[PDB]
Design goal:
The complex is a heterodimer of chains A (16) and B (952). Chain A is mainly β. In chain A, 0% of the residues lie in helices and 19% in strands. Chain B contains 31 helices and 36 strands. Chain B is globular, with a radius of gyration of 35 Å. By secondary structure, chain B is an alpha+beta fold. Chain B has seven domains: 10-116 and 296-303 and 685-694, no CATH class; 118-250, no CATH class; 306-448 and 583-587, no CATH class; 462-575, no CATH class; 614-679, no CATH class; 712-808, Alpha-Beta Plaits; 810-952, no CATH class. In chain B, strands 1, 2, 3, 10, 11, 14, 15 and 29 form an eight-stranded mixed β-sheet that branches. An eight-stranded mixed β-sheet of chain B has the order 18-17-16-21-20-19-12-30. The chains are: A mainly beta (16), B alpha+beta (952). The interface between A and B is medium-sized, with 11 and 18 residues. Chain A: It comes from Lactococcus lactis. Chain A: This is Lantibiotic. Chain A: Belongs to the type A lantibiotic family.
């Protein structure tokens, strides 16, 4: 299937 | 008790008697630009800066770049004469010894220890990994770790930036990674293993997915094996050659090895053009701001007096003694957080521990990452209130009297303290500058001071010579022998820094049994990150264990790499591996905010020079910078302290005044301050051609682990309305007893009709509440029925709110899920009797009160667990009213206890397992009956001790 993705995600470093 | 080892001696190449003074900045460029030695020193240390100077002299440099060029050159000039700290071509490292007479003179010969720049080298290999991946073989990066549906790394690299990156845990990541978990696997076989359980249709994707793991460094190629830890030109070149068919990289690499070897025999001054050749052959291969590192070793041998040896050992004891007053550190509070979340019976996977969503996060003082939930700062205690009054008192009087502060005053306080406790500290490294005052030689303690990381200051120099390797080996064999006694596996953390500029600091030789690698690989035995589990000693001390071999671990970083820079988990592993108290000297902490601090001294040693803080805001139109510093009685020669380094200045020299005015106006921009220190004459102690050198020195000085691997949340968590229902009833302390009398028995009656059973507990934190846990077969129906009783208690203002929560079972504490369930039957039986005991305590027709019931019930527990065998009962106790007995609830409790006692016998529980479990069951009875109270639980045992003895 498409479990060849990798899906790299990268991150940086109310009410009242 | 502290013995002064042979030390490292660090000294300048150039001699400060030859220092020229200067009046103008252009004059400084003129002189320096035909100073043969300086420019080789500059070309090696700071290539980019050296080129900017060339650019300026050619007229090609933009005007706004010129003030900085002028200041950096002047500061670099002062440094090549005045600053002994070891760095390529400014200064040299030798070994010194203790004898019967001082020998301050260097007969030896200077040699160049030369490595490639490590950032350059890794950046090349990474370029080879992508270009030549099909000819390489690959292994798993120890930095990777699964977490749910994601694969994380303890830190990140390729995005040449500062941001963390993670990937999905796919079936294809699993196959590829497990296949490379233990050895290196050829590109082709990695690809094959994927298609062989997908189809050859997928060979496209496999290769792509594989390439993407290689860019992002989820895998490591064989070019990296020993590439940062024990580099060998043979081994490196033969694998490159095996890879590089079109000869693109081999031959330039062979030429670089040649040119460096040629550079090795040239004098300091004469190699400028040979160096230019090295930079040229290396810049063609791949450009970098630095290409070469040099550590200059000598084979001189400086000697110090027997008195000197004693002065230093005296100083070591005093400094180590002050740690006696460090009662609670940031790490202690973390140990407490640990115990609240986990108890004492669990071992926790380190990557689970530091997770801020699933574990306890990090110590409050860790920043990689800082905790991302709010929490206020914890109590610490690095010195006593009495100590602080003395230090401030000492401070106030010295300033009033224009005196220095003699720390001698408290030497007898600190050596006296805790003569009972066996001091943990194995050893110290101390950093000292040699100078003079009134023609007498003095030692001045570095502002770095030192640390308790033995071998840290020598590990970098270990490999560069056999004498050095011998030296370092001696220093750390005092730690390795003791690790061997205690049956502890030592282990060096070997890692590519997250910011690869710092990659030349990490160098050391591996003197341990195993290695914990990140973004590299070695030939040693290596620990898997996700095999490291954390627990708590018999003494509530953090330890680390490999879950695959059950080995106990201590981790080491035998270098000067800033320990606060690491990822939390690695910083933690390092910190639990030494003795956590050396670090924060009280005078540093208490005098920190004063803008004048006297000199601190101790037995002829200058602990800390006189220190000023000058404020931008103070330079006024009625006040220039030079009568400002004169209004504060600044001596004519002082240092301005920047950070890592300091810059020598004189009021007599006008160039030095320009640098200071520059300095003062930069800080008036940020609205803060600069730091001045007093100057010591430091030029003519160590010498060579009977010419002084600036010199400094670095002196070294010299169970039954139970615990069980933590159970997964899937197995320990009991979700609302499945098997259990768990309510937190927020009721005040003064009204919980009334709730237990007048409301709980209506709830127990209800759950009984439905065939179930419940137990409760009292808990504060956050606010006070009762934890009600009901086990029963139609839980939605039982919730419905007791909801009427709860509404009644809201109306009467006894309960405010409740939550329904996940019941996190304490499987490890109560011995496994089997003995846990039998413990829970004890809980529920104990809970049935409590409202009746409270009613006896409350009724006055009785004249039995709460403490009488407590010793009694506690008495009956012990009589149950040990079957009325008083001698066993007192066995247990040494190491830490008739109608309740004929009560039907108590008979039911007595069966519950017999049944737990039997199963513990059946499964051969070691006896301290049984002693801890009975202590726990009695502990939560007391919680139920009386307060959530500390130690008054324990003194119940003492009086029961007396009553049982009397049965005899």
């Amino acid at each position: 299937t498409k479990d060849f993705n990798l899906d790299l995600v990268c991150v940086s470093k109310t009410x009242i | 008790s502290f013995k002064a080892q042979p030390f490292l001696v660090r000294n300048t190449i150039l001699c400060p008697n030859d220092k020229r003074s200067f009046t103008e900045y252009t004059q400084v460029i003129e002189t320096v630009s035909k100073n043969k030695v300086f420019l080789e020193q500059l070309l090696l240390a700071n290539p980019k800066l050296y080129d900017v100077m060339q650019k300026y002299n050619a007229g090609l440099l933009k005007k706004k770049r010129v003030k900085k060029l002028f200041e950096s050159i002047y500061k670099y000039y002062k440094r090549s004469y005045l600053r002994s700290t070891p760095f390529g071509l400014f200064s040299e490292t030798s070994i010194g010894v203790f004898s019967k007479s001082s020998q301050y003179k260097l007969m030896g010969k200077t040699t160049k220890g030369i490595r490639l720049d490590t950032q350059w080298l890794i950046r090349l290999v990474h370029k080879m990994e992508v270009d030549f991946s099909k000819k390489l073989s690959f292994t798993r990066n120890n930095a990777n770790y699964k977490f749910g549906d994601r694969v994380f790394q303890v830190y990140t690299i390729n995005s040449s930036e500062l941001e963390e990156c993670n990937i999905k845990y796919t079936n294809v990541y699993q196959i590829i990674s497990e296949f490379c978990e233990n050895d290196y696997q050829k590109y082709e076989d990695i690809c094959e293993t994927v298609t062989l359980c997908y189809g050859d249709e997928y060979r496209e994707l496999s290769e792509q997915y594989l390439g993407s793991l290689i860019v992002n460094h989820y895998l490591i190629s064989n070019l990296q094996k020993d590439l940062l830890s024990d580099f060998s030109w043979n081994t490196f070149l033969t694998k490159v050659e095996a890879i590089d068919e079109d000869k693109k990289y081999i031959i330039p690499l062979k030429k670089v090895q040649k040119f460096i070897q040629e550079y090795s025999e040239i004098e300091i001054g004469e190699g400028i053009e040979k160096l230019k050749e090295i930079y040229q052959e290396m810049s063609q291969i791949l450009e970098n701001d630095n290409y070469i590192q040099i550590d200059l070793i000598s084979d001189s041998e400086i000697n110090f007096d027997v008195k000197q040896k004693q002065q230093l050992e005296h100083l070591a004891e005093f400094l180590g003694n002050t740690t006696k007053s460090v009662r609670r550190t940031y790490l202690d509070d973390y140990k407490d957080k640990f115990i609240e979340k986990y108890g004492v019976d669990q071992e926790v996977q380190i990557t689970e521990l530091f997770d801020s969503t699933f574990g306890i996060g990090a110590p409050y003082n860790y920043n990689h990452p800082r905790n991302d939930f709010y929490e206020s700062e914890p109590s610490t205690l690095y010195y006593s209130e009495e100590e602080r009054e003395k230090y401030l008192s000492m401070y106030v009087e010295a300033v009033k009297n224009h005196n220095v502060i003699n720390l001698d005053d408290l030497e007898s306080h600190y050596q006296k303290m805790d003569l009972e406790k066996k001091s943990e500290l194995q050893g110290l490294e101390l950093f000292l500058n040699l100078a003079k005052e009134y023609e007498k030689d003095i030692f001045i303690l570095g502002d770095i001071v030192g640390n308790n990381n033995l071998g840290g200051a020598s590990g970098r120099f270990s490999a560069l010579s056999p004498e050095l390797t011998s030296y370092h080996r001696t220093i750390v064999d005092s730690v390795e022998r003791e690790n061997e006694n205690k049956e502890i596996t030592s282990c060096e953390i070997v890692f590519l820094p997250e910011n690869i500029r710092h990659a030349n600091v990490m160098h050391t030789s591996i003197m341990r049994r195993k290695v914990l690698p990140f973004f590299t690989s070695t030939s040693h035995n290596e620990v898997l990150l996700t095999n490291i589990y954390i627990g708590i000693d018999e003494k509530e001390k953090f330890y680390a264990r490999d879950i695959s071999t059950q080995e106990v671990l201590k981790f080491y970083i035998t270098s000067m790499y800033n320990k606060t820079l690491f990822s939390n988990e690695l910083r933690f592993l390092y910190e639990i591996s030494l003795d956590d108290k050396f670090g924060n000297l009280p005078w540093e902490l208490i005098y920190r905010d004063f803008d004048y601090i006297p000199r601190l001294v101790f037995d002829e040693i200058v602990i800390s020079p006189a220190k000023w803080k000058i404020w931008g805001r103070d330079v006024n139109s009625k006040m220039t910078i030079r009568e400002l510093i004169q209004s504060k009685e600044i001596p004519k020669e002082f240092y301005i302290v920047n950070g890592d380094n300091k810059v020598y200045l004189s009021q007599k020299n006008p160039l030095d005044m320009e640098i200071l005015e520059s300095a003062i106006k930069k800080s008036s921009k940020r609205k803060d301050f600069i730091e001045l220190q007093e100057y010591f004459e430091d030029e003519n102690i160590i010498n060579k051609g009977e010419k002084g050198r600036v010199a400094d020195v670095v002196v070294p000085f010299i169970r039954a682990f139970i615990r069980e691997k933590r159970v997964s949340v899937e197995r320990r968590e009991k979700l609302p309305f499945n098997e259990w229902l768990y309510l937190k009833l927020y009721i005040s302390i003064n009204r919980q007893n009334e709730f237990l009398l007048s409301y709980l028995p209506d709830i127990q009656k209800i759950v009984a009709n439905l065939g179930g059973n419940l137990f409760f507990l009292r808990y504060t934190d956050p606010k006070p509440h009762i934890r009600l846990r009901i086990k029963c077969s139609d839980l939605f129906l039982a919730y419905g029925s007791i909801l009427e009783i709860l509404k009644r208690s809201r109306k009467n203002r006894i309960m405010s709110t409740f939550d329904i929560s996940i019941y996190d079972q304490e499987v490890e504490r109560y011995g496994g899920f089997d003995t846990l369930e039998l413990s829970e039957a004890i809980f529920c039986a104990d809970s049935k009797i409590i409202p009746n005991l409270l009613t006896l305590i409350k009724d006055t027709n009785n004249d039995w009160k709460v403490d009488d019931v407590s010793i009694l019930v506690n008495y009956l527990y012990l009589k149950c667990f040990f079957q009325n065998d008083n001698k066993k009962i007192l066995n247990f106790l040494n190491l830490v009213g008739d109608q309740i007995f004929y009560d039907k609830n108590f008979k039911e409790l007595k069966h519950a206890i017999k049944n737990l006692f039997l199963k513990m016998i059946a499964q051969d529980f070691e006896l301290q397992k049984v002693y801890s479990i009975i202590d726990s069951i009695i502990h939560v009875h007391n919680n139920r009956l009386i307060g959530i109270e500390r130690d008054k639980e324990k003194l119940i045992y003492y009086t029961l001790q007396r009553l049982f003895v009397s049965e005899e």
